[PDB]
Amino acid sequence: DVVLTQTPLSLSVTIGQPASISCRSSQRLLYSNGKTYLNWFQQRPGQAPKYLMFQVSKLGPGIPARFSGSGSETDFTLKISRVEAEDLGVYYCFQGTFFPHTFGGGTKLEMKRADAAPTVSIFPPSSEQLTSGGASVVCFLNNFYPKDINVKWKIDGSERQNGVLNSWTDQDSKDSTYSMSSTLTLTKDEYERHNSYTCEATHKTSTSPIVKSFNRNE
Amino acid sequence: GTGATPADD
Amino acid sequence: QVQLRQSGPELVKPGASVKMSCRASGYTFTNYNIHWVRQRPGQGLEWIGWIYPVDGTTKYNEKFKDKTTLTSDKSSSTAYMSLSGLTSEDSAIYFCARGLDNWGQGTSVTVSSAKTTAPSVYPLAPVCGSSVTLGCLVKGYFPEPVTLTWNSGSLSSGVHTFPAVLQSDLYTLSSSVTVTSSTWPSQSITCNVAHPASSTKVDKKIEPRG
16 A cells, blocks of 8 residues: 655644645555646645545646646645745645555644643542542643643652543634643542652653642641 | 546446 | 435344435536445545436445445435345444535444443542643443533533443443633532433532542
C-alpha cells in the first residue's frame, strides 16, 4: 500500500502569516491517464472533512485562493498565503491513484501564542464517593501553552499509574491555551492506607516539576 | 466526476 | 444544496454488527460514487471502500473487506454500510462521502459490553489565594452524552469541561470552574449534570470541606 508521510505533525500559525505543510509519498502517484490523484482535506475538530484540493493543485469547490498545492514525484506541498482563523484544524493528504486509497497522518494547525504555565489544582475524594467505597483524586492543569505536558501521580512519594484516567481539551478558541484533567481512582480502603497524594506536572514553562499535594490525615 | 480518484473522474 | 445526512449513533456489543445509512439529496444520486471512511478516536482517516449507485459495483480496502458490506438504493438516494463482527477496534466515526467532494456528518459506533448506566456525580471542593478552582467529577456512565453546566449556565467563563473518556466500558468526564475568592464560598456554586439515556438529572452543590 502507498504510505503518505506528513510534516510537521503540528504547525503553530499566526493570523496573516504564511503557512506550508508537506506530504511525502512512499511511491510515485502518476496514474496511467497522466493525472496525479493527490488530494488534500481539511477537518475542523468535531466536524466532517472538506475537499480542499485535488490532483495536486486543483482547488476544491468554494475553496479560497489563499490555498495552493504543488509537487511531483513523491513530495507534495500545501501552502496558505495568509492564515485566517478558519484555517485552524487538521489537514490530511490523500492518494487515489492506487488501491487501497490512503491518507497521510494529518498536520494540525494550531494558534501560536506566548508560553503559559498551568494552574494546577488537586482535589481529594468527595465524601459522597467515599461512602460508596471509591476514592478518586483529581488534578486539573489549566490554561497552559504549548500543549505538551506530562503528569505523574505519587502516593507517599511512590509513583502510581494503575487507575489513572487523563483527558485533554482542544485548543481554546479565545485564549489559545490547553487544559488537562487527570483522575487517579482507588478504593476507599486503598486510599486509607496512605497519607500523601501528589500530582506532579512537567512543562517547559517550569524549571523543576510543579507539585500539588495533600495529606489525607490533615 | 469530482476528480478525486480515477473512478471519480 | 448537496447534503449527505447520516443515521445516528450506534452502540454495539462485541461480536455483533451494525448497519448505518447515508441519505443523499441535492444532486443526481447516480452520478457519483459513495465512499466510506473511518476515523477512530484520536486518529486519522482510513478509506473503507466505495459503491457506484448505478449498478451496485463496489471496491473495498482489503483491510475492511471481511467485515464490511456496502449497498445502495437508487430509488431512495440512500447508501448503507454494514459492519460485522466488531471489536473495540471498530469504535469510530464513519463518514460517507459523494466522490469525496462532500462528506456526511458521520455516524459514531461504540463497541462495548456496557448497558445504560447513570453517572455518579461528585462535587470537588478545594483541599481543607485570590483565585479558587472547583470541580465536578462525572463517573461511571454509559452511553454518551452527558450535559454539564455550572449554576444552570450562569457560570460560563473560566470553565473547562473535559472530553469524556471510555475506560473499562464506562465513561468518565470532569469539569473545573475558576472564580475569585470573593465569590466562593460566599455564593452558591452547583454542578448540574444530565444524562438523557438514563433520564438522570442531578445538581451537586460545592461545599467547603470539613
